[PDB]
Write a protein that binds this ligand. Structure first.
Ligand SMILES: [Fe+3]
Length: 53
């Protein structure tokens, strides 16, 4: 699946790994993250992410 990178801090959301610490299980698409999900490292919104893969 895709990788999305936070432009502010470089954190990569990997759809194959999800974000289990915030209740997002492996295999969840970036589009299916909650509208108000933020970068776990810097707090930037989804609008600051771009697909890198
Ligand atoms: Fe970030």
């Amino acid at each position: 699946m895709a990788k999305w990178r936070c432009k502010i801090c470089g954190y990569i959301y990997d759809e194959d790994e999800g974000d289990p610490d915030n209740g997002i299980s492996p295999g969840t698409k970036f589009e299916d993250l909650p509208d108000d999900w933020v970068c776990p490292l810097c707090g930037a919104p989804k609008s600051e992410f771009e697909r890198i893969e």
